[PDB]
Amino acid sequence: EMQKIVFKIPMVDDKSRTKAMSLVASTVGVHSVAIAGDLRDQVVVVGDGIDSINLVSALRKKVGPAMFLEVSQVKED
Amino acid sequence: IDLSRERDPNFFDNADIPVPECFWFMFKNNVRQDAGTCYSSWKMDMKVGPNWVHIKSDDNCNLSGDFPPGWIVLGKKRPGF
């Protein structure tokens, strides 16, 4: 069912946050993306049919050294 | 660890999906690493330092898992939930 994937992208700056969100939002399967967390380097992705390995690779090539923090499913009502 | 003295996580509640009931806080020794939101009565896989941990939450946002030595992820029910 519905994916929740959270990356940590350390050392991201505001322009790189914007770049990260654009990249994520343009990815097949993505419904939403937000930047959160104590350092503002959590990238919270929700969708369905997201190829998360292809996504982390693209973030690493274009943004910064992204790492997985969480993979889970949305708890539907 | 005294969660009463911890600042809230910096979260974004997504309007399209149910609101997660719990705050989580990750620590190594006494030191907060990051924090976020998660569902109660649920499960997630989270990277905790050098190890993935399968974390289960109960109805009261208590979090269970095989955490690596020195690490913990602690849950709290959000206010109003």
Curated annotation (Swiss-Prot), chain A:
<comment type="similarity">
    <text>Belongs to the disease resistance NB-LRR family.</text>
</comment>
<comment type="subunit">
    <text>Interacts with AVR-Pik through its N-terminal part containing the HMA-like domain.</text>
</comment>
<comment type="function">
    <text>Disease resistance (R) protein that specifically recognizes the AVR-Pik effector avirulence protein from M.oryzae. Resistance proteins guard the plant against pathogens that contain an appropriate avirulence protein via an indirect interaction with this avirulence protein. That triggers a defense system including the hypersensitive response, which restricts the pathogen growth. Contribution of Pikm-2 is required to recognize the effector avirulence protein AVR-Pik.</text>
</comment>
<feature type="region of interest" description="HMA-like domain">
    <location>
        <begin position="4"/>
        <end position="77"/>
    </location>
</feature>
<protein>
    <recommendedName>
        <fullName>Disease resistance protein Pikm1-TS</fullName>
    </recommendedName>
</protein>
<feature type="domain" description="HMA">
    <location>
        <begin position="2"/>
        <end position="71"/>
    </location>
</feature>
